[PDB]
Amino acid sequence: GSHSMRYFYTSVSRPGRGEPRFIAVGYVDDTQFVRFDSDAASQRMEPRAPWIEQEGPEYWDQETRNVKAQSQTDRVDLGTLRGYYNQSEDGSHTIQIMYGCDVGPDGRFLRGYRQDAYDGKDYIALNEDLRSWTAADMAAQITKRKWEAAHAAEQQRAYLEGRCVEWLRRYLENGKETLQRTDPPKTHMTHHPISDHEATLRCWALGFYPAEITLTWQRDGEDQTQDTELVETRPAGDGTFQKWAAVVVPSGEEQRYTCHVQHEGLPKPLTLRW
Amino acid sequence: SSCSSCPLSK
Amino acid sequence: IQRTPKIQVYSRHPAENGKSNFLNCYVSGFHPSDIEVDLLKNGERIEKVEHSDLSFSKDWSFYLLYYTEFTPTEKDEYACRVNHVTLSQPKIVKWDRDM
């Protein structure tokens, strides 16, 4: 199926406490593979997945030049945007940037992305045409004119349609053993009386990869979506994910309810009953 | 791989 | 504009008393990124706790996983204590082995 690669950058001002905190992370699909931390010793882009470890110094040197240049650009931008918004020097603010590309099962480019935030809200974004920008507010309009004059979109598009997809294909091949696996969920049910007349049924999915999954409850074959408590899909810490779904049922009627689990790893959707 | 030319001042 | 964390506390594997495992506290949906996350054993902060590198979702909210190796027992209560600007006092979320 399809795959993604994304870079996420966070810069946070800390007035009177030195230079802003800068953190970079890179992912392929749901697997993190690199990091940079302005506050760490090494001052290099570092590996965080085993399959990237094999890249040589020519890679790590260019990646370090890149993340350093991003961190310096973002540090100056924190000053600029404080100015655009007429904010005092005393408060802490945050720039976030995401960019990356999606590829289809044939490895071909599907979509590219570049979007930036200020204090957790949209600031400026590259449109799907990879040619024009959408500015969230008047500050971002100032940035937009600047970026239109510097032909910023053409540079981003060049990366998104080229290097981004090329290296995504390289990683999918070199980390094939983990990136291209499907680990189907391991499923079970739990059951807890709440009173004499109600009980909880909880349907578990564990140990699955990728993160995308669907868990649904039915009663006599009918969807119970609005009566289902879900938790957000969460990391197990070993590179797999977890989720559960629960319903409250009349004691004695458990057998009318079925849990349905759909995942890429499964030959067939699973059905569970108590 | 990340982008070498993309950063431009806001 | 600030956003308060969602918190889930859970084990990597279903808990079995006496069998080694990992205790996870997963914090997400928050802004700003400055946060403290402590795992407590019978009210006592565990010294050695690691976390994932800071990242964020498409809605720009941050997420982090804090974790530590542990062996559950019937005796021990575990909790996650989350300290964030959106909370006038730290929120303590008890571990439930079936959540």
Residue numbers in the entry:
A (entry chain A): 1 to 274
B (entry chain C): 1 to 10
C (entry chain B): 1 to 99
Paper excerpt:
The peptide binding groove of MHC-I molecule contains six binding pockets, A-F, which span and accommodate the binding peptide from the N-terminal to C-terminal. A minimum 8-mer peptide is required for structural stability of the peptide-human leukocyte antigen (pHLA) tri-complex that is contributed by two amino acid residues of the peptide that serve as “anchors”, one that fits in pockets A/B and the other in pocket F4–6. The overall structure of HLA-A*11:01 in complex with various peptides (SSCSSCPLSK, SSCPLSK or SSCSSC + SSCPLSK) is similar to the standard MHC class I molecules.
Continuous and unambiguous electron density was observed for both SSCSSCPLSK (10-mer) and SSCPLSK (7-mer) in the antigen-binding cleft of HLA-A*11:01. Apart from interacting with Tyr7 and Glu63 with its main chain amino group, P2-Ser also interacts with Tyr9, Asn66 and Arg163 via water-mediated interactions. Additionally, the main chain amino group of P10-Lys interacts with Asp77, and its carboxylate forms a number of direct hydrogen bonds to residues Tyr84, Thr143 and Lys146 of the antigen-binding cleft. The carboxylate of P10-Lys also makes interactions with Asp77 and Thr80 via water molecule. The 10-mer peptide adopts a 3.4 Å bulged conformation upwards compared to its 7-mer counterpart; as P4-Ser and P5-Ser of the 10-mer orientate towards the exterior, while residues P4-Ser and P5-Ser of the 7-mer are seated in the cleft and thus adopts an extended conformation. The results for the pHLA complexes demonstrated that the longer peptides with two functional peptide anchor residues had higher melting temperatures (Tm) (Tm = 68.1 °C for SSCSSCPLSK and Tm = 69.7 °C for SCSSCPLSK) and are thus more stable than those formed with only one anchor residue. pHLA complexes of the various combitopes generally had melting temperatures similar to that of the complexes formed by shorter peptides with one anchor residue (Tm ranging between 48.7–50.3 °C).
